[PDB]
Design a protein around this ligand. Structure first.
Ligand SMILES: Cc1ncc(C[n+]2c([C@](O)(CO)[C@@H](O)[C@H](O)[C@H](O)COP(=O)(O)O)sc(CCOP(=O)(O)OP(=O)(O)O)c2C)c(N)n1
Ligand SMILES: Cc1ncc(C[n+]2c([C@](O)(CO)[C@@H](O)[C@H](O)[C@H](O)COP(=O)(O)O)sc(CCOP(=O)(O)OP(=O)(O)O)c2C)c(N)n1
Ligand SMILES: [Mg+2]
Ligand SMILES: [Mg+2]
Ligand code: NA
Ligand code: NA
Lengths: 620, 620
């Protein structure tokens, strides 16, 4: 479809639109008493041209799967996003004045309770990665005509996550993706490092494989032309702008970031801007080509029960890869992402079987999470991203923002705990339960054998929110029958007798250490109840307390994790104040070191001998 | 001091050294049964030339403050680091064979229990940032002649944190810093994206402001010359290498990352390598110019007591900046870092008073933490880095690694909780207590007024480990006298009577909400004990239980944080099983939204009215 080269009246209408967007941005933030009108004003021509010349979308159905996508990476410009959706006819004009009120959904930064928002972007530097996932999905999965546009600030470009996304887009030839850089010279508290050195921005973009075009970001003409032209590779529109453009006395000045205009000033400036608008008539949005496919919303089921054998030995990391590949045969919705760790997480098994649905993300965990979030938007795919659980700490802000984005992504982190052995602490996840439990939409699976792992993968696929599966490096015995039923929030009692002295709660390697402790203790005529949580969040409080009441009130938790935020604290918080109930904890008390897995479990006090000693001390 | 242009015999000795380093790397990893000899072998000429031609250091005193610094960013090449320190005479040869044993300190990745290691680097992409802090310190603080050298992998370059460091180094003109890029074509599980496209690496480095030199990384001559030449700006030595160089049959092959050679193969390959060594005589290290200044190790004390007034209103974020500036007058060791948030965290006050000791880190939280870690190495400075607590989640892996690095850094995160109001959840720290409590070397301060904030800054300065100070946006009343004594692990009872019904534990805004609840409740003839923890980690368990025993065993915790990993869970874990003790929690149960601070405290159930209702329900 041809570029429509605008006439001078269309160009004037785009200028008028940009100026209306400035006025609203000022009105809304002055009404709120907070916000970022100067950050809106540098972007006003960009927004007018994108929404009212370049992009194709259903104005009354912002989530429509055929629409071009727009990602406001510089999310503090939210008031101008809201203004463009009022200009397009989706939002009521009057509602814009309710910015940041508890009575409104026009919140301080964009969030997906808004139909026109797919991802929340208030934490800078994350929007381009989500946009990359949207574009990858458009080109390779949906195979549709929609384009993806992402608006970034210049200060924002200091975030490394942006450059991971830059590199991803050129690796994967995302010629349907456009990044618009609002080079307004200034960040929050000082000039951005490169200021108006447009040539260095261009060199950086080009060095990372993008087609880079420098424009006057306040020229509607130049913007129409640069956006109109497609682009064989990801394209960066490097827009020279002025912060506070159009606000006399404030344009290009420090000390105005995140500062609203006082009422008296807003009124004077708005009259100035208004004087430059030549018509009140609004431009209409133009709709998309409807070529996005249907996607299935049904439950995704494993094609058969697990086929392990009780007593065989397999690491849950390897069971994860097996289970994920298996599930990929049941549904084309499943996609897998990994950060150059596929041979260690065993996501390589999925790649072997389903290569078209595997995304190599390289050593770039931040971006990997953002790609997954973008792929999950509009329910287009069901992503599973993997790396070592320790390296998901590199992506915690992306995970945090994924929950604010109401995203349905699945994360599998391997190599938990000291039981990995010889690599040492840099590779050992000892804080991942703390991390993921603190994510408000999370479900935390900690499968203890291959059967439980397969069941966790299936359950995660069908569970909303941030699903985390903690996998382990040691081979451990299969303990569950293949037809054992598993559910979110349902634990399992894996050993019991009527004379049990203590309820021992373990998971992964420490479950197996607890079972081995039970055998040690049998020699002493001491029986212990052993409980496998299955999910750490939510925790089966009922079965834990029913168990504890059968074992003189006594609970011992043992975990390959630090003391804070893990299993022991979850249990303690669940049962505190319950009459007659006591909880004793065994966990890892400090940064570990290299050695054999069994040696480290011993050193850090979480192996079978440590468990047996704690049990005896409770009995006395 | 002149470049010493080596003769052919010195060059042959450097080749011999490189080959000895290969042999040891193989021997050690084969002995261990794990490790990364192919990653060592690509770097062997680089290591030989750096340690035995270019760098200047005391071989018997690796931590000496005058020494050049070397940072092994690609930390899985640890065996070749160990080998070079044995070659230099510091380590015993025989100890190299004890790699990864629980009986050795030659662990799988480098750690600072090793004298020759300043920062732990097992999580890729972090070493260059630490090296930047070392170089910044050398040039601007120590004003010394030492240089800083950092060896990176090519896959590693996919991490965004590397590019933040690249940009930092050119902003700050770190002409004493050299990055060596081991472009061996391969990552862990596939070729690195750019493979041997040396020109694109050069363009990326140059676009980020570095002087970039492409070399044959297996030519000792070319390396000597490129390292010899200083360099007016940060310099990237872009070394074309082959993974597994020198291992016949393995050089340049996939499927060998992190795979040790079997014994039979190691023996054959070592005989091959050994055959190419022309002399056993070792080269000696060359010592540094001793021009690093003395640094003071004494306690750092505030120059006076706090000068607040009880009843005056100040936000703890603003008290932080005031206190940090004050402390900077007492000692030149204090430095401040911030990520383009200085006007919102109030670190701008320190910048105003002590500009030479403020480091603007721009919107790049990962790198900021790494700069701080590097500045703290060898005790050269006492860093305080600040941003919003929510954005420290962007740096969790750097923080995690800082504890593995035994680093003494101070972090102040503002804008905690829903009480920030209108910006919404992207800015709200609701998981920072979970995060920082899980860091094993951490001390977590949560000051509730300006006095407590000043005391926390002073205590943090003098406390080892990862110190976190949680600051808040609302102005709240000063409640403490200026001469109130504060200590790590000591809480305060701020309201009590002999007829108290409940012990209410709050902090920051929720302390003030609890005090307001106490006034509400007085109307009903209900008294409550109110306790301010001061430190969340470590928690004053004794005062909490003594308090609870005075209030019928009843504890209510109220926090502007999610339920998991915060104050309520810390308290529950501390007191679980204590007879007669109950704990009830109020926290934030889901992702928040925009509104006024008081409105959000109400919506999320943590304001004075919520507290008063929970107290009444306990009494019944
Ligand atoms: C990951 C990350 N780091 C730092 C920031 C902080 N930040 C921004 C805001 O958080 C808005 O999103 C900031 O304004 C706060 O709203 C404000 O500090 C609150 O102030 P208070 O009243 O004191 O509480 S925006 C920003 C600068 C971005 O510059 P840019 O990319 O050049 O964009 P421009 O605005 O010029 O177009 C910074 C540092 C965030 N959010 N994320
Ligand atoms: C932040 C981050 N992300 C990913 C990785 C993983 N990783 C590396 C190791 O972790 C070593 O540090 C990895 O080998 C593990 O030791 C190994 O997977 C364990 O295997 P197991 O036996 O299955 O348990 S190293 C690496 C590739 C680096 O490539 P490069 O930069 O090009 O360096 P080169 O080796 O060629 O010189 C990856 C992905 C880490 N660590 N950090
Ligand atoms: Mg800007
Ligand atoms: Mg490599
Ligand atoms: Na899910
Ligand atoms: Na400290």
């Amino acid at each position: 479809e041809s570029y429509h080269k605008p006439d001078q009246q269309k160009l004037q209408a785009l200028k008028d639109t940009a100026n209306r967007l400035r006025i609203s941005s000022i009105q809304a933030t002055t009404a709120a008493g907070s916000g970022h009108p100067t950050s809106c004003c540098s972007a006003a021509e960009i927004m007018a041209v994108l929404f009212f010349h370049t992009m194709r979308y259903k104005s009354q159905d912002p989530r429509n799967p055929h629409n071009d996508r727009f990602v406001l990476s510089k999310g503090h410009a939210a008031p101008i996003l809201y203004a463009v959706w009022a200009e397009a006819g989706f939002l009521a004009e009057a509602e814009l004045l309710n910015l940041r009120k508890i009575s409104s959904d026009l919140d301080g930064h964009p969030v997906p309770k808004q139909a026109f928002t797919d991802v929340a972007t208030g934490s800078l530097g994350q929007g381009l990665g989500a946009a990359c996932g949207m574009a990858y999905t458009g080109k390779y999965f949906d195979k549709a005509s929609y384009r993806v546009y992402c608006l970034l600030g210049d200060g924002e470009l200091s975030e490394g996550s942006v450059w991971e996304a830059m590199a991803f887009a050129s690796i994967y030839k995302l010629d349907n993706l456009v990044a618009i850089l609002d080079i307004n010279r200034l960040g929050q508290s000082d000039p951005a490092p490169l200021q108006h050195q447009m040539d260095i921005y261009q060199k950086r973009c080009e060095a990372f494989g993008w087609h880079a075009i420098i424009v006057d970001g306040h020229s509607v003409e130049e913007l129409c032309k640069a956006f109109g032209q497609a682009k064989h590779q990801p394209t960066a529109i490097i827009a020279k702008t002025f912060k506070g453009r159009g606000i006399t006395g404030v344009e290009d000045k420090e000390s105005w970031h995140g500062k609203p205009l006082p009422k008296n000033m807003a009124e004077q400036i708005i009259q100035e801007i208004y004087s430059q608008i030549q018509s009140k008539k609004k431009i209409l949005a133009t709709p998309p080509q409807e070529d996005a496919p249907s996607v299935d919303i049904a439950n995704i089921r494993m094609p058969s029960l697990p086929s392990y054998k009780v007593g065989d030995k397999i690491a849950t990391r390897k069971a994860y890869g097996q289970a994920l590949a298996k599930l990929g045969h049941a549904s084309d919705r499943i996609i897998a992402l990994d950060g150059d760790t596929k041979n260690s997480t065993f996501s390589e098994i999925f790649k072997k079987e389903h290569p078209d649905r595997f995304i190599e993300c390289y050593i770039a965990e931040q971006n990997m999470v953002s790609i997954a979030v973008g792929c999950a938007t509009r329910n287009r795919t069901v992503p599973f991203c993997s790396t070592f659980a320790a390296f998901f700490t590199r992506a915690f802000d992306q995970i945090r923002m994924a929950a604010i984005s109401e995203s349905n992504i699945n994360l599998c982190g391997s190599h938990c705990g000291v039981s990995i052995g010889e690599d040492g602490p840099s590779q050992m996840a000892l804080e991942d339960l703390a991390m993921f439990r603190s994510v408000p939409t999370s479900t935390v699976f900690y499968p203890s054998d291959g059967v439980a792992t397969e069941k966790a993968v299936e359950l995660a696929a069908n569970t909303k929110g941030i699903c985390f599966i903690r996998t382990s490096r040691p081979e451990n015995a299969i303990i569950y029958n293949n037809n054992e039923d598993f559910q979110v929030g349902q634990a399992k009692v894996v050993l019991k007798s009527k004379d049990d002295q203590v309820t021992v709660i373990g998971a992964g390697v420490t479950l197996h250490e607890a079972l081995a402790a039970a055998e040690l203790l049998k020699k002493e005529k001491i029986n212990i109840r052993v409980l496998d949580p299955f999910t750490i969040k939510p925790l089966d409080r009922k079965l834990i307390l029913d168990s504890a009441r059968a074992t003189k009130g006594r609970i011992l938790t043992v975990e390959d994790h630090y003391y804070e935020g893990g299993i022991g604290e979850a249990v303690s918080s669940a049962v505190v104040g319950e009459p007659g109930i006591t909880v004793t904890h065994l966990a890892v008390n400090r940064v570990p070191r290299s050695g054999k897995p069994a040696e480290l479990l011993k050193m850090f006090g979480i192996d079978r001998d440590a468990i047996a000693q704690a049990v005896r001390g409770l009995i006395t």
